[PDB]
Amino acid sequence: SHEQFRAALQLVVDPGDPRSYLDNFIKIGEGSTGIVCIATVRSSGKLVAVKKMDLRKQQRRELLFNEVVIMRDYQHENVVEMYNSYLVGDELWVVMEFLEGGALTDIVTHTRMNEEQIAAVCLAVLQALSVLHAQGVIHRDIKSDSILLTHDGRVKLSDFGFCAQVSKEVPRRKSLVGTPYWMAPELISRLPYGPEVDIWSLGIMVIEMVDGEPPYFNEPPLKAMKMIRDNLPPRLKNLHKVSPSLKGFLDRLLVRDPAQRATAAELLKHPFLAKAGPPASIVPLMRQNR
Numbered sequence: 001s002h003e004q005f006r007a008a009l010q011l012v013v014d015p016g017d018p019r020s021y022l023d024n025f026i027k028i029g030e031g032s033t034g035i036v037c038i039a040t041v042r043s044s045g046k047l048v049a050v051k052k053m054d055l056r057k058q059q060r061r062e063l064l065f066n067e068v069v070i071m072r073d074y075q076h077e078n079v080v081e082m083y084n085s086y087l088v089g090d091e092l093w094v095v096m097e098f099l100e101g102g103a104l105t106d107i108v109t110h111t112r113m114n115e116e117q118i119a120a121v122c123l124a125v126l127q128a129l130s131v132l133h134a135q136g137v138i139h140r141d142i143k144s145d146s147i148l149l150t151h152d153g154r155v156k157l158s159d160f161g162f163c164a165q166v167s168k169e170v171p172r173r174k175s176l177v178g179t180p181y182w183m184a185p186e187l188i189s190r191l192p193y194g195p196e197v198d199i200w201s202l203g204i205m206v207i208e209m210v211d212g213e214p215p216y217f218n219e220p221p222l223k224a225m226k227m228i229r230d231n232l233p234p235r236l237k238n239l240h241k242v243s244p245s246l247k248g249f250l251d252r253l254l255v256r257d258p259a260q261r262a263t264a265a266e267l268l269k270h271p272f273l274a275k276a277g278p279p280a281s282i283v284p285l286m287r288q289n290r
């Protein structure tokens with residue numbers, strides 16, 4: 001039943017109608033299902049990012065709860081800050097921080113990040129997942145699309161709609177969730193995965209940074225998934241452009257056996273990351289510079 005779902009969500013959103021304190025809506029996106037917009041908090045003149053999800057169009061509607069789970073988190077400096085959530089009409093509205101630098105994806109598919117920048121980005125994404133795996137939170141949809149930027153190179157993880165909660169009574173999961181191309185092998189396989197799948201996906205994302213696209217990017221999302229399950233871990237198209245160190249870091253990530261795949265905890269010290277450049281290194285990467 002819809003109305004019972006709505007009711008249940010009603011209990012987790014802030015009450016009321018933010019349509020009353022916001023204006024200058026500017027559409028700019030498509031993800032989850034439903035739009036990303038930008039608006040101006042009337043009271044302060046400040047900019048937010050408003051994400052609207054129709055409750056009627058969702059693959060698994062109760063994944064909607066998860067969204068709002070990262071309330072008041074961390075508030076982590078590498079996590080997109082959420083401010084509020086409302087129910088409005090037949091939609092969920094999440095009102096969060098505005099990330100004026102756009103996503104990483106545009107960068108990954110228009111330029112060639114050098115390793116100082118790769119490092120940086122992984123630094124900030126790891127510094128993030130560590131905390132999350134620590135308090136049980138899986139993300140489940142890591143990719144360049146899910147990474148966000150500021151006009152000054154601060155990097156923040158985002159798009160938490162797919163994430164999951166785990167404790168020691170309830171550690172593992174089974175759900176097929178994620179973007180095909182980036183899914184950890186156990187997950188296509190359907191197995192009792194944990195946080196470690198975030199590590200796998202980041203490796204695919206490193207490929208993004210390096211090569212511009214993920215493995216098997218042209219293959220039907222369907223059959224590319226098999227390749228990701230049977231196959232020996234994927235070629236880096238431009239391996240010759242990358243330092244042994246980078247490939248050595250990457251090797252800790254793309255292990256077919258999850259037990260051997262490194263943890264963010266492990267990874268945060270692996271020497272490659274000594275390469276990580278300041279936020280200001282990322283700036284000439286963003287569209288404006290070019």
